[PDB]
Paper text:
In nature, S‐adenosyl methionine (SAM)‐dependent methyltransferases efficiently catalyze this reaction with high stereoselectivity. This study presents the investigation and rational re‐design of a potential methyltransferase, termed SeMT, from the actinomycete Saccharopolyspora erythraea. A putative methyltransferase from Saccharopolyspora erythraea NRRL 2338, henceforth termed SeMT, was identified featuring 56% sequence identity with both StspM1 and SgMT. While its three‐dimensional structure elucidated via X‐ray crystallography confirmed extensive structural similarity to cyclic dipeptide‐processing methyltransferases such as SgMT, its putative catalytic center is clearly divergent. Accordingly, wild‐type SeMT displayed minimal activity with diketopiperazine (DKP) substrates, triggering an extensive mutagenesis effort aimed at iteratively enhancing this methyltransferase function.
Crystals of SeMT belong to orthorhombic space group C2221 and contain two copies of the protomer per asymmetric unit. As expected from the amino acid sequence similarity, SeMT features the same overall architecture as found for indole C3‐methyltransferases SgMT (Haase et al. 2025) and PsmD (Amariei et al. 2022), with the putative catalytic cavity located at the interface of a Rossmann‐type α/β domain and an all‐β cap domain. The two chains in the asymmetric unit are highly similar, featuring root‐mean‐square (RMS) distances of 0.55 Å both for 264 matching Cα atoms and for 1060 main‐chain atoms (least‐squares alignment using COOT (Emsley et al. 2010), using the prevalent conformer for residues with alternative conformations). In particular, the demethylated cofactor SAH (included in the sample for crystallization) is found embraced by a binding pocket that is virtually identical to the one found in those enzymes; this includes R82 and C60 essentially sandwiching the planar adenine ring, D81, which is hydrogen‐bonded to both hydroxyls of the ribose moiety, as well as E58 and R35 forming salt bridges with the homocysteine ammonium and carboxylate groups, respectively. Finally, the characteristic tyrosine side chains covering the cofactor (Y12, Y19, Y126) as well as the histidine‐acidic residue dyad thought to participate in catalysis (H218, E216) are retained. Indeed, while the catalytic cavity of SeMT resembles its counterpart in SgMT with respect to size (417 vs. 378 Å3, determined with the cofactor in place, average of chains A and B in either case) and overall character (hydrophobic patches dominated by aromatic side chains, interspersed with polar groups), residues at individual positions often differ notably in size and polarity. Preceding a regular and stable α‐helix (αA′), it features a more irregular terminal stretch we have termed the lid for its presumed role in controlling access to the active center during the catalytic cycle.
Author numbering:
A (entry chain A): 1 to 268
B (entry chain B): 3 to 267
The structure:
Amino acid sequence: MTVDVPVSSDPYANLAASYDRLVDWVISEQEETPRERMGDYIESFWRDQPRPVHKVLEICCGTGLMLGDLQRRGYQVSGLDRSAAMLEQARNRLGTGVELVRAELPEIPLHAGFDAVISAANGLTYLPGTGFGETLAAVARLLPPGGTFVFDLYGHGFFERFYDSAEPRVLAVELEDVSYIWTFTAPPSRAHFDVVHSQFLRTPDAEAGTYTRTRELHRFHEHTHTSVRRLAAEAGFSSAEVHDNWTSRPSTPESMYDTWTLTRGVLE
Amino acid sequence: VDVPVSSDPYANLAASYDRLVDWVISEQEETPRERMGDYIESFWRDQPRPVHKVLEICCGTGLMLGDLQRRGYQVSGLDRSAAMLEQARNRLGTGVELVRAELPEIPLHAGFDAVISAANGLTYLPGTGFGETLAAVARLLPPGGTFVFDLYGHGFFERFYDSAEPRVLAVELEDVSYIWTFTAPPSRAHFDVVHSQFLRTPDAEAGTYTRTRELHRFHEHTHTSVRRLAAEAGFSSAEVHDNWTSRPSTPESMYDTWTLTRGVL
Ligand SMILES: Nc1ncnc2c1ncn2[C@@H]1O[C@H](CSCC[C@H](N)C(=O)O)[C@@H](O)[C@H]1O
Ligand SMILES: Nc1ncnc2c1ncn2[C@@H]1O[C@H](CSCC[C@H](N)C(=O)O)[C@@H](O)[C@H]1O
């Protein structure tokens, strides 16, 4: 339909069952960092901090790809996501002993503290500026002095790559049992950035060649370096560094993904 | 999942083709039929013999023929696709002669003042059938009669077959979504596009689509080859320009427009 696709309460509800396979493709062809290398970066940062990390929360934990990596390294992990469908996959991966809470950021209905909080593979880009700042504030209240918060965002280069003309760009891939078509549009103001995620899955109990299309609107926000630094300071983080895509290289106007390392200050 | 060449690659596309052409025009530099007709008419007005009877081979759904019909020419069409010709018969009416045949066969029993082929149908012919088609067209024309057609230019093959991984292009249109995958063998003897098409399923609940996949197999005919085959067919002149303009053709051209003139016997 040429008419606009509305924003659903859970844009991942139809994707959760095929998400892990799609991640494999984004890692191969769209520079997304493997969760093992994200974990290596996170652990290296933690090892530079004076307080040891044991309890870890991931917000926007999705199907648990990042949490599963940390579980295998020996951490006591917990997850939060707004999508029941994603969390069902995470439950299968992590087992029944891991706490997984369904909540929509900036709400974090957890009272006990964590030694560290993370968010991998760009979930925080779904938050508008106001809710992003409130999420940083909520994460700060879970951390002790010196505790860390490590997350990624789409970098400036992502927005310039996929929103560079009045005419929308289209990206597609055909995988074994699913075809995806992504159409990227943004308002003239560029206040947010939309992707229509069209997914074609074979229709069960139907003649060969039959597919069911579902469409979901994924609405992204660019959080600039200057805004992230301001909101981190407001939330009570005494330092905030950014690097290019889970490496030690500087973040630049070309970066496709930015990786933020925040340290909680000493004022409660 | 490999796709073979169908006898009619356009059978599943004919019903959606005119709308797809609107998108190619707005995004892939295909020339509107009115501007192709303008170019053709300007070329004809440089010839000493007036043009009235016009045949288009690879006439498809009749978009080019409809433009010339509007201008007053007596038009005829040839295409191998019954599905495409059904659309052409709707646009042009029942009085226009439309013949189903696969080039190089042209089963017609009278000549034309001019022959055309618009929007790159002749790129589906390999070298041998392309040369035989030029020979068949020459035999429809009087001395000095002209043949105007387009081909994919060198820039098209460079743009879509240079990457280390096969290029994928896509769009969602009205009731149909397309994914195109561009591959070529190492020999580069031909150039393939797999046309993966999701078309709404009639009488099914909303969101049901039927996928069909068609192989479109293209050939690059170099300028040297075209001039050689034009000479062999009996054309005395053969000029090439960039995409239906008077600008010269270059290695960067996406579309080449050929203007051939039949020689004297
Ligand atoms: N406001 C919000 N509150 C909670 N979860 C959110 C959210 N906005 C997006 N998400 C979640 O962000 C996730 C992004 S996909 C990333 C999943 C996982 N971290 C991984 O490494 O693969 C989705 O599961 C989505 O449901
Ligand atoms: N060998 C062949 N013989 C006859 N028609 C052919 C052919 N190879 C390709 N075609 C036809 O070439 C057409 C290309 S599409 C172009 C259609 C029309 N000239 C227009 O201006 O839109 C299709 O209709 C296809 O069926």
